Design a protein around this ligand. Sequence first.
Ligand SMILES: CC(=O)N[C@H]1[C@H](O[C@@H]2[C@@H](O)[C@H](O)O[C@H](CO)[C@@H]2O)O[C@H](CO)[C@@H](O[C@@H]2O[C@H](CO)[C@H](O)[C@H](O)[C@H]2O)[C@@H]1O
Ligand SMILES: CC(=O)N[C@@H]1[C@@H](O)[C@H](O[C@@H]2O[C@H](CO)[C@H](O)[C@H](O)[C@H]2O)[C@@H](CO)O[C@H]1O
Ligand SMILES: CC(=O)N[C@@H]1[C@@H](O)[C@H](O[C@@H]2O[C@H](CO)[C@H](O)[C@H](O)[C@H]2O)[C@@H](CO)O[C@H]1O
Ligand SMILES: CC(=O)N[C@@H]1[C@@H](O)[C@H](O[C@@H]2O[C@H](CO)[C@H](O)[C@H](O)[C@H]2O)[C@@H](CO)O[C@H]1O
Ligand SMILES: OC[C@H]1O[C@@H](O)[C@H](O)[C@@H](O)[C@H]1O
Lengths: 103, 103, 103, 103, 103
Amino acid sequence: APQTITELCSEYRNTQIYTINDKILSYTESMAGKREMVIITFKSGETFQVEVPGSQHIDSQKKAIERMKDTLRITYLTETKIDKLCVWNNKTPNSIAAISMKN
Amino acid sequence: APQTITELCSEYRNTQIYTINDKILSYTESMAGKREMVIITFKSGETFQVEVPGSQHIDSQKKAIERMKDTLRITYLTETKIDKLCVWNNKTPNSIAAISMKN
Amino acid sequence: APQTITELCSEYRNTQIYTINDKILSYTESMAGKREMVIITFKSGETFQVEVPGSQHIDSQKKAIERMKDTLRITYLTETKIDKLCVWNNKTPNSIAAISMKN
Amino acid sequence: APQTITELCSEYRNTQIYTINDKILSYTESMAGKREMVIITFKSGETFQVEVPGSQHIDSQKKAIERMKDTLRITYLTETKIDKLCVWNNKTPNSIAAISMKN
Amino acid sequence: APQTITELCSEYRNTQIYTINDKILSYTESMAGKREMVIITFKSGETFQVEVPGSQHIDSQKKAIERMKDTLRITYLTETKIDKLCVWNNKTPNSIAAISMKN
Ligand SMILES: CC(=O)N[C@H]1[C@H](O[C@@H]2[C@@H](O)[C@H](O)O[C@H](CO)[C@@H]2O)O[C@H](CO)[C@@H](O[C@@H]2O[C@H](CO)[C@H](O)[C@H](O)[C@H]2O)[C@@H]1O
Ligand SMILES: CC(=O)N[C@@H]1[C@@H](O)[C@H](O[C@@H]2O[C@H](CO)[C@H](O)[C@H](O)[C@H]2O)[C@@H](CO)O[C@H]1O
Ligand SMILES: CC(=O)N[C@@H]1[C@@H](O)[C@H](O[C@@H]2O[C@H](CO)[C@H](O)[C@H](O)[C@H]2O)[C@@H](CO)O[C@H]1O
Ligand SMILES: CC(=O)N[C@@H]1[C@@H](O)[C@H](O[C@@H]2O[C@H](CO)[C@H](O)[C@H](O)[C@H]2O)[C@@H](CO)O[C@H]1O
Ligand SMILES: OC[C@H]1O[C@@H](O)[C@H](O)[C@@H](O)[C@H]1O
């Protein structure tokens, strides 16, 4: 298995690493129909989403999608510095695939 | 996908944005039959609910409804300042569709 | 929908409001068979339960019962002041229907 | 229903109350097959488990077993003082039936 | 049942104990398809994973896998010192079977 977020990100098409090195500036969460998603922004101006679950996701990703949103909320609330994001860049906003944080 | 709560809110009928810019004043949670819901208030006097799950909700909203109540409780407990709420105004109290918080 | 805990409580038979205005003194949690429940007490001497799930509960209440126990544990741990409880008084200890907290 | 941990404990064969009056010294969690369990110890030298789910458990106990492990982890992390444990003494380590904490 | 992480670890083939005695340096979480996993590192240079769920896991381990990832995230966030890890050494990075923390 991959040993780092960069190694993991390299396994996928339509991905890149953003080096954030910052806490989340804003957290947005929606339960509106067809828009059940989270949006985060950074003071850099960058915006990312956790996508609405759909056919681009396999069954094993369902719990992982819910965990990622859990992680983003608590990261926001604790002002925890995010190191890197691996994102799909074929979506607007870019879609989060993986997150790393270092201490 | 939308990049902000205001963009998201505009996609729906019977919605508006409330600019809260404040922590939650009170948190109310009910497990009583047919009233399984959360109500929050602000010192402004405004009151909002997360609705009881019903036929106005699609399957993808079920986990999202539970998440929103999770978010409101921890937001209350941490005295986290809410930025905006996107609400359905065809309900009393107005019904929460999305929340944003900024730091 | 109701706008306050008192309004909500008034919709049900065999209920009343206790005004607590205090943190939880003790928290008890059981996983013993047929006694899967939580008991809380206050320095006033009042004791309350979240009942074991049973036929007095409809399907919509199952997640709500689990949320209520989640709420009591974290409220206990954070020493959060409870404002009111709406309880069913036809049970010993009185059984929690709703909880409010204010800040 | 019982109003205290001692009342509840008394309802069961093969149980006893340990008065702990202390925080958890160590927390151990296993996801190893057939050993999906939690072990806690105290500076007293006592060791307790939450048992692996098995045929000695009824369906209503499944969520309660998961809740108890959730409770022990957060109690450990917050250094919360445990008051009493109701344990089954026909297991090694003794198996947790109920927990109480007072403030 | 085992009374310590070392006793538990000894029940399994392809395992060993790492004595960590340190907080987590980095936390990485992925929701990418077929890589739904967590990776942690320590300043020692050691790297560990919670494996993607697969046929090497029995049904009883599914909830335990999810709990282990929950534990690693909160442990990271709270800077909680890990005592030992029991890991399967037939995987790269080594795969976490059990964790202990002491206070
Ligand atoms: C169902 C089960 O126990 N699976 C494990 C597997 O079991 C073997 C039995 O299927 C076989 O019949 O008997 C032998 C003992 O004589 C085994 O118990 O054994 C494999 C390999 O040892 C285990 O795989 C391990 O799984 C863990 C995760 O649970 C981890 O991924 C580790 O890397 C891996 O080797 C099965 O657990
Ligand atoms: C079943 C399967 O392998 N499906 C893949 C898709 O995952 C993939 O789409 C990507 O999906 C991710 C999230 O899983 C994200 O939404 C990306 O934007 C999206 O492109 C698709 C194209 O690579 O291939 C399918 O095989
Ligand atoms: C199946 C479907 O799309 N149904 C929608 C409804 O969502 C919508 O009702 C709104 O639902 C939201 C919660 O999702 C909230 O309760 C609003 O108060 C409610 O009006 C309905 C009416 O506009 O349109 C349907 O198409
Ligand atoms: C099955 C059903 O709908 N039963 C209702 C009950 O809700 C109600 O009983 C009350 O149930 C609550 C928990 O929901 C609590 O346990 C109360 O103590 C209990 O009385 C019953 C009595 O009014 O009415 C039924 O129709
Ligand atoms: O509910 C679980 C309990 O069930 C009993 O019947 C058993 O003797 C106890 O040791 C405990 O495991």
